[PDB]
Ligand binder design. Sequence first.
Ligand SMILES: COc1ncc(-c2cc(NC(=O)CN3CCOCC3)c3cocc3c2)cc1NS(C)(=O)=O
Length: 858
Amino acid sequence: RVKKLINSQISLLIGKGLHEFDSLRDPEVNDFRTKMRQFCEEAAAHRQQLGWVEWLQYSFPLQLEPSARGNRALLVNVKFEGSEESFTFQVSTKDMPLALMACALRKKATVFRQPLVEQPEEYALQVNGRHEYLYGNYPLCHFQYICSCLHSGLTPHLTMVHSSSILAMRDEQSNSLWSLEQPFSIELIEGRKVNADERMKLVVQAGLFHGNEMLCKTVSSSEVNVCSEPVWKQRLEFDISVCDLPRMARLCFALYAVVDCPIAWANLMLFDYKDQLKTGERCLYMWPSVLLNPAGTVRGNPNTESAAALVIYLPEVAPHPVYFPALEKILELGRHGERGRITEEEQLQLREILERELYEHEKDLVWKMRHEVQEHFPEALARLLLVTKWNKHEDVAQMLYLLCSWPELPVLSALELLDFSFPDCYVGSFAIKSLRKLTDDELFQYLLQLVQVLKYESYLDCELTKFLLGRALANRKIGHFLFWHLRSEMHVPSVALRFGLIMEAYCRGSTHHMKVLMKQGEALSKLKALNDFVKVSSQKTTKPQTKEMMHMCMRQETYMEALSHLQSPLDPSTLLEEVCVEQCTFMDSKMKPLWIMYSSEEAGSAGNVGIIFKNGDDLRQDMLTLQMIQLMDVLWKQEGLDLRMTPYGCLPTGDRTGLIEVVLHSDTIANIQLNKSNMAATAAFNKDALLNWLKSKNPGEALDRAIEEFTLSCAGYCVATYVLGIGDRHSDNIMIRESGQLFHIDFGHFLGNERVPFILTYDFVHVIQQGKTNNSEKFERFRGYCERAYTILRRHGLLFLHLFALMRAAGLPELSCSKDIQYLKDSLALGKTEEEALKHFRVKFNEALRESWKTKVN
Ligand SMILES: COc1ncc(-c2cc(NC(=O)CN3CCOCC3)c3cocc3c2)cc1NS(C)(=O)=O
């Protein structure tokens, strides 16, 4: 009776009725659902018997300063849970939270006149009106909240939570092949539901691929006239023996009418998930094209009513079922071989090509010397896997014998092995095995990417699915973001199945979070409906009248209930409590996004947050551009360079639907540039507007930090926008914070999509120099910041180049081919030495400085 209640709720949350999974009557889906439910059930169980501190590490994972993960006078306002009274203590930034708790329980004792039994080990420090906690043995300054407070000059507000209270929340949440030498062949029987120009003839181009690389030369079909139902019944004979086919082998098809014009495409794995070599008739429900597309999904098109079907016949090779040899048989064959016996002369050449694409003889050198490659250069695994001939059974057995006994690579090297260039499942398992060491902070930084690698998966049940699920159930934030990255792509038919199953499994592992995300979903349902009125009304009537019948609408009992008392999809630590209906408006852009305001009694001024709801644009590129800027900011802070960046939240939630974080107390450059009369910023020259503006937002001595806050953020934004190749930078998409902090918004076109140069703007160069015309001292400190930020970004170029490589799986039209990844392999300048790249960056900056001189002349 509780089950059907849970199952109706899962289906509603994922926006796909679980009956549809059963309807397919697919044994691969039916096994994932049983196998993965069990895993998640085991997880939930282990989680319900966690310690009170351990539970904190789940529900509220520590938010630490990049500098700290891996002295100064500070006033702090601590209170106790069931209390109205509070205390202000003058702690230090070097103090552990415990000394504060010890301080708080001493003050409580004296006030309440009682010799207190309580110890500070029994307590935790909640951030007031937040799902943020201050625990462990880390100085206060190490905590992101405490640190933000010092910069903003604000007083940290903490509530003392007893172990009993945490436990009370913990509780309230309890739920043989190698013999077959014949050349692999197929029968292209017929086609169905095809549409093409009568004047042409149809062709089927089939090819055998292992990731991207061809396993052999592709074979085309006979030219058969344009018919909705064309018939071939021909034998497509491929130049590859049945034994030689690898385990992760995929057969790709291309249907195209020629006089070139592609109709559709469809791929499939020759081996089933249970390692059986597929035999019988197969009807490939193709996907529309825009000649082979390996990377494309191996499971058929769901809408079978429009889709052009291709019926093929996998012939019976042996008299009984053939299963891919087990590792036992694989390691036996690859054990024996001739070891790499070569001259120190050719060993020198080997170190060169490994430390440094490569020539044919060079590959042969990497393959003959594979044992040395494992012994003295293990990080060079990927390059060795690329010299391997996956179209010969014995070379693969040789490779997998070296991998099985290969040392665990670092996290940076394991990210390369997730890419489609390495489709071997034992290589991927090893990749995840080398990735397991990932810190929960690190994992979260690369989760967007590892979730995109799920689209490169051949089979439903895989290491990556199990690893992400197990990690998501071990950290409520990872679980929050995992769900939303999955949920947002349910409209896409090529993933709706996989994703739905992943999310259904997750729900079995966290019944309570399933209720929390359903609460969030129900709010976004109302916002989609509200935005629809706004889109319509903004056309007919004026903004004051739309802004009013939108409030009236939000005032309704359904709206008031759904839009209030929830966690933010933008950050689950953020508790969007009571909605400020009067403070709610909508931007005047094409889509008419919504500005939703929130406020809290508990959180206080730190609880007055805002969100932006947008329906109409694809939000996946901005999300990527902002994760990159945030990573840039993490990589800089790690080297002690804090360029005071603002990577505000962005999160796609559904079909062309998402949320953007309101950065309160910020305004677009342009708005200030308007130089309106009767204001506190009204200038005699347009050059002054920003400076005069900062003056008013930063009186007296406060101006000097604001200018410096401006300089750093500007250094970082120039450097963030150069590397990423962010174009279309007008006055609108640049915003300034009252603190002086500068930031960018609306990331329409990155990776030069032609070739975006270094950008410098005299209106900000006038602010940097503190109003002065010639101020080489202050300006050249800004040039120094740019150089520092640029060189730190280059030293992590393989990290950006690996996260952009994997991100190709999303299908962002400004990130799909080789040239897009060349952009970073040109901006981060990884061919040139640090000195040769620094030479070229200064030459790029000076050119921008000269370009900025178009205004200094006028
Ligand atoms: C991806 O699109 C966007 N990317 C970013 C933002 C965005 C916008 C902000 N603020 C405003 O637009 C304030 N306005 C209100 C109306 O008068 C002018 C000033 C933000 C402040 O903190 C983070 C912000 C992020 C918006 C869009 N969508 S749009 C450009 O079509 O409205």
